[PDB]
Amino acid sequence: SIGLAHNVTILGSGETTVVLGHGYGTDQSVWKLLVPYLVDDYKVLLYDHMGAGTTNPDYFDFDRYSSLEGYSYDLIAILEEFQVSKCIYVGHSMSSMAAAVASIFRPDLFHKLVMISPTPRLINTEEYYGGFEQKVMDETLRSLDENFKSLSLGTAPLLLACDLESAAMQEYCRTLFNMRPDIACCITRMICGLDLRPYLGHVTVPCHIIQSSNDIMVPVAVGEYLRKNLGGPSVVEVMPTEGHLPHLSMPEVTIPVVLRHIRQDIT
C-alpha cells in the first residue's frame, strides 16, 4: 500500500488537513515538536518521502527519483489515497519545492504552501546568487561518492549551524545516516542539479516563505527572489535564526513562526 510504503501517520481532528513533509536527510520524526500544537485545530498527515532510511530500499526508483517530480507525483498519490483536499502543506527545503511542483499539476489539492528554507537553485549564474559557484559544486559532486560519510559529518555542523554536542545534530545524523549511501547521493545529486526558476511563475497557490537570516544553502536574497517571481500571493519571513533546518535546531523561534503562517492567511 502507498500508506505502508510512506509510513503515513494521521493525527488530530478538524475541517482542514495539515500535511507535513520532511526535508533531505530527516524523516517525519523531525516534526515531533510541532505536531502537538496542531492536533486540537487540524487533522495532521505526516509521511516519509521515498529514500528515507525508514522506507524500503527495494522501492527506490533511481531514475524516477533523479528528478524532483518523482516526489511531486508521490505526494499527489498520497493525498488522493487519503482523500485530502485543499490541504495546508508544510515542507522543508526540497520537500516544499516538490509540493510547489505538485501544486502546479493539481492546485485543487493545496490551500497554501508553508515553506521552510526553500531555494529554486543552488548554483550561481551571473545575475542570480544561489550560494554556490558551479566549480565548487561540480568538484564536490564528482567525488561525492568516495568521500560520502566524512563530507557529511564535516558539513552537517555548518549546514545545521549547530554544535556536534547538540540534540539537533545527534538527531539529524541519526536519520541522515539511516539512508543507504547510494540512495542519499542520488537524492543529493538531484537536489544540487535543480533549477526551478522557469517554473515559479506557474505556481499560483499562496506561498509562505520562512527563512533563516543566515543559511549557507539559502542566501537571504533568494527568499525575496521567490516572493517576486512566484505566480500567486506570497509572504516572506526572515527569522532571527541560523542554519538550514531551523525547525529542528531553533524550535523556540521557528515553531511560533510556523504556526502563525499555518493559522493566518495572506489572502
Coordinates of C-alpha atoms in Angstrom, one line a residue:
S1 CA 0.0 0.0 0.0
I2 CA 1.0 3.6 -0.5
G3 CA 0.2 4.3 3.1
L4 CA 2.5 1.4 4.2
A5 CA 5.2 2.5 1.8
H6 CA 5.4 6.0 3.2
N7 CA 4.7 5.3 6.9
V8 CA 1.7 7.6 6.7
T9 CA 0.6 8.8 10.1
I10 CA -2.8 10.6 10.7
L11 CA -3.5 12.5 13.9
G12 CA -5.6 15.4 15.2
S13 CA -9.0 16.5 14.1
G14 CA -10.6 19.3 12.0
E15 CA -12.1 20.5 8.8
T16 CA -8.5 21.3 7.4
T17 CA -5.6 18.9 6.9
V18 CA -2.0 19.9 7.7
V19 CA 0.4 17.9 5.6
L20 CA 4.0 17.7 6.9
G21 CA 6.7 16.8 4.5
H22 CA 10.3 16.4 5.8
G23 CA 13.4 17.6 4.0
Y24 CA 16.5 15.8 2.8
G25 CA 18.3 13.7 5.5
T26 CA 15.4 13.6 8.0
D27 CA 12.0 11.9 8.3
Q28 CA 8.7 12.6 9.8
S29 CA 10.1 12.4 13.3
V30 CA 11.6 15.8 12.5
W31 CA 8.1 17.3 13.3
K32 CA 7.8 15.8 16.8
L33 CA 7.9 19.2 18.5
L34 CA 5.5 20.9 16.0
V35 CA 2.6 18.4 15.9
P36 CA 1.1 18.8 19.5
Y37 CA 0.3 22.4 18.8
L38 CA -1.7 21.3 15.7
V39 CA -3.8 18.3 16.8
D40 CA -6.5 20.4 18.5
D41 CA -7.3 22.5 15.4
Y42 CA -6.3 20.5 12.4
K43 CA -6.0 16.9 11.3
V44 CA -2.4 16.2 10.6
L45 CA -1.0 13.8 7.9
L46 CA 2.7 13.0 8.1
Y47 CA 4.7 10.9 5.7
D48 CA 8.2 9.9 4.7
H49 CA 9.5 10.6 1.2
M50 CA 10.9 7.7 -0.7
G51 CA 14.6 7.0 0.1
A52 CA 14.3 8.0 3.8
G53 CA 16.0 5.4 5.9
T54 CA 12.6 4.3 7.2
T55 CA 11.4 3.3 3.7
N56 CA 12.2 0.1 1.7
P57 CA 15.4 0.1 -0.3
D58 CA 13.8 -2.1 -2.9
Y59 CA 11.1 0.5 -3.6
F60 CA 13.5 3.3 -4.5
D61 CA 13.4 4.1 -8.2
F62 CA 16.8 5.5 -9.1
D63 CA 15.7 7.1 -12.4
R64 CA 12.3 8.2 -11.0
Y65 CA 13.9 10.0 -8.1
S66 CA 16.8 11.6 -10.0
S67 CA 14.2 14.3 -10.8
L68 CA 12.1 16.3 -8.4
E69 CA 8.6 15.4 -9.8
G70 CA 9.1 11.8 -8.8
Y71 CA 8.3 13.2 -5.3
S72 CA 5.6 15.5 -6.5
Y73 CA 3.7 12.6 -8.0
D74 CA 4.3 10.6 -4.9
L75 CA 2.8 13.4 -2.9
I76 CA -0.2 13.7 -5.2
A77 CA -0.8 10.0 -4.8
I78 CA -0.7 10.2 -1.0
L79 CA -3.3 12.9 -0.9
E80 CA -5.5 11.1 -3.4
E81 CA -5.2 7.9 -1.4
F82 CA -6.1 9.6 1.9
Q83 CA -8.8 11.8 0.3
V84 CA -7.2 15.1 1.3
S85 CA -8.2 18.3 -0.5
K86 CA -7.1 21.9 -0.2
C87 CA -4.5 20.9 2.5
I88 CA -2.1 23.3 4.2
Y89 CA 1.3 21.8 3.1
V90 CA 4.3 22.4 5.4
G91 CA 7.6 21.4 3.8
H92 CA 11.2 21.9 4.4
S93 CA 13.7 22.6 1.6
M94 CA 13.3 20.2 -1.4
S95 CA 10.0 19.0 0.1
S96 CA 8.4 22.4 -0.2
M97 CA 9.6 22.6 -3.8
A98 CA 8.2 19.2 -4.8
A99 CA 5.0 20.5 -3.2
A100 CA 5.1 23.6 -5.3
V101 CA 5.5 21.5 -8.4
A102 CA 2.7 19.2 -7.2
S103 CA 0.5 22.4 -6.8
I104 CA 1.1 23.2 -10.5
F105 CA -0.4 19.9 -11.7
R106 CA -3.1 19.7 -9.0
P107 CA -3.9 23.1 -7.4
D108 CA -7.2 21.8 -6.0
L109 CA -5.1 19.7 -3.6
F110 CA -3.5 22.8 -1.9
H111 CA -4.9 25.7 0.1
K112 CA -1.4 27.0 0.9
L113 CA 2.3 26.2 0.9
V114 CA 4.3 26.9 4.1
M115 CA 7.9 26.5 3.0
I116 CA 10.9 26.4 5.4
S117 CA 14.2 27.4 3.7
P118 CA 13.2 26.8 0.1
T119 CA 15.5 27.5 -2.8
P120 CA 14.8 27.1 -6.5
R121 CA 18.5 26.8 -7.4
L122 CA 21.9 26.4 -5.5
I123 CA 24.4 27.0 -8.4
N124 CA 25.2 30.6 -9.3
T125 CA 25.0 32.3 -12.7
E126 CA 26.0 36.0 -13.2
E127 CA 22.6 37.5 -12.4
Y128 CA 21.3 35.2 -9.7
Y129 CA 23.1 34.4 -6.5
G130 CA 22.2 30.9 -5.2
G131 CA 25.1 30.4 -2.8
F132 CA 27.4 28.0 -4.8
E133 CA 29.7 28.5 -7.7
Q134 CA 29.4 25.8 -10.3
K135 CA 33.1 24.7 -9.8
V136 CA 32.9 24.0 -6.1
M137 CA 29.7 22.0 -6.6
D138 CA 30.9 20.0 -9.6
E139 CA 34.1 19.2 -7.8
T140 CA 32.2 18.1 -4.7
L141 CA 29.6 16.1 -6.7
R142 CA 32.3 14.5 -8.9
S143 CA 34.0 12.9 -5.8
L144 CA 30.9 12.8 -3.5
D145 CA 30.7 9.0 -3.9
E146 CA 34.0 8.1 -2.2
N147 CA 34.0 10.9 0.5
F148 CA 30.4 10.5 1.5
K149 CA 30.4 9.8 5.2
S150 CA 33.3 12.2 6.0
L151 CA 31.9 15.1 3.8
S152 CA 28.6 14.9 5.6
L153 CA 30.0 14.6 9.2
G154 CA 32.1 17.7 8.4
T155 CA 29.4 19.7 6.7
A156 CA 26.4 18.9 9.0
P157 CA 27.5 21.3 11.8
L158 CA 27.7 24.1 9.3
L159 CA 24.6 23.1 7.4
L160 CA 22.6 23.0 10.7
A161 CA 24.6 25.8 12.3
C162 CA 24.7 23.8 15.4
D163 CA 27.2 22.1 17.8
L164 CA 28.2 18.5 17.5
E165 CA 27.1 18.1 21.1
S166 CA 23.5 19.3 20.4
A167 CA 20.4 17.2 20.4
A168 CA 19.7 18.6 16.9
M169 CA 23.0 17.3 15.5
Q170 CA 22.6 13.9 17.2
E171 CA 19.1 13.5 15.6
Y172 CA 20.0 14.8 12.1
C173 CA 22.9 12.4 11.8
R174 CA 20.7 9.6 13.1
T175 CA 18.3 9.9 10.2
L176 CA 20.8 11.1 7.7
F177 CA 23.0 8.0 8.3
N178 CA 19.9 5.9 8.3
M179 CA 19.8 6.2 4.5
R180 CA 21.7 3.9 2.2
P181 CA 24.6 6.0 0.8
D182 CA 23.8 5.3 -2.9
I183 CA 20.2 6.5 -2.3
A184 CA 21.5 9.5 -0.5
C185 CA 23.9 10.6 -3.2
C186 CA 21.3 10.2 -5.9
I187 CA 18.9 12.5 -3.9
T188 CA 21.8 14.8 -3.2
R189 CA 22.7 15.0 -6.9
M190 CA 19.0 15.6 -7.7
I191 CA 18.8 18.5 -5.2
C192 CA 22.1 20.1 -6.3
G193 CA 21.3 19.8 -10.0
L194 CA 18.0 21.6 -9.5
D195 CA 16.8 24.9 -11.1
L196 CA 13.1 25.6 -10.6
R197 CA 13.1 29.3 -11.6
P198 CA 11.4 28.6 -15.0
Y199 CA 8.5 27.2 -13.1
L200 CA 7.9 29.7 -10.3
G201 CA 5.6 31.9 -12.4
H202 CA 3.2 28.9 -12.8
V203 CA 2.7 28.4 -9.0
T204 CA -0.5 30.1 -8.0
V205 CA -1.3 28.7 -4.6
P206 CA -0.5 31.1 -1.7
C207 CA 3.1 30.7 -0.5
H208 CA 4.6 31.4 2.9
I209 CA 8.3 31.6 2.7
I210 CA 10.1 31.1 6.1
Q211 CA 13.8 31.5 6.2
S212 CA 16.8 31.8 8.5
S213 CA 18.7 35.1 8.3
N214 CA 22.0 33.1 7.9
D215 CA 21.7 29.9 6.0
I216 CA 24.7 28.7 3.9
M217 CA 22.3 27.0 1.5
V218 CA 19.8 29.8 1.3
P219 CA 21.1 33.4 0.8
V220 CA 18.6 35.7 2.4
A221 CA 18.0 37.4 -1.0
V222 CA 16.8 34.1 -2.5
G223 CA 13.8 34.5 -0.2
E224 CA 12.8 37.8 -1.7
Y225 CA 13.5 36.4 -5.2
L226 CA 10.7 33.9 -4.6
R227 CA 8.1 36.4 -3.5
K228 CA 8.8 38.4 -6.6
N229 CA 8.9 35.5 -9.1
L230 CA 6.1 33.3 -7.7
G231 CA 2.9 33.4 -9.6
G232 CA 0.4 33.8 -6.8
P233 CA 0.3 35.5 -3.4
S234 CA 3.3 35.4 -1.2
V235 CA 4.9 36.4 2.0
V236 CA 8.4 36.2 3.4
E237 CA 9.6 36.0 7.0
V238 CA 13.3 36.1 7.7
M239 CA 13.6 34.8 11.2
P240 CA 16.3 35.7 13.7
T241 CA 17.7 32.1 13.3
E242 CA 20.7 30.3 11.8
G243 CA 21.1 27.1 9.9
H244 CA 19.1 25.3 7.1
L245 CA 16.9 23.2 9.4
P246 CA 15.8 25.9 12.0
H247 CA 12.6 23.9 12.8
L248 CA 15.0 21.2 14.1
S249 CA 17.7 23.4 15.6
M250 CA 16.0 26.5 16.8
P251 CA 12.4 25.3 17.5
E252 CA 11.9 28.0 20.1
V253 CA 11.9 30.7 17.4
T254 CA 10.8 28.6 14.5
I255 CA 7.7 26.8 15.8
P256 CA 5.8 30.1 16.7
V257 CA 6.6 31.5 13.3
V258 CA 5.5 28.3 11.5
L259 CA 2.2 28.1 13.5
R260 CA 1.3 31.7 12.6
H261 CA 1.7 31.2 8.9
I262 CA -0.2 27.9 9.2
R263 CA -3.1 29.7 11.0
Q264 CA -3.1 33.0 9.2
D265 CA -3.6 33.6 5.5
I266 CA -2.2 36.4 3.4
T267 CA -5.4 36.3 1.3

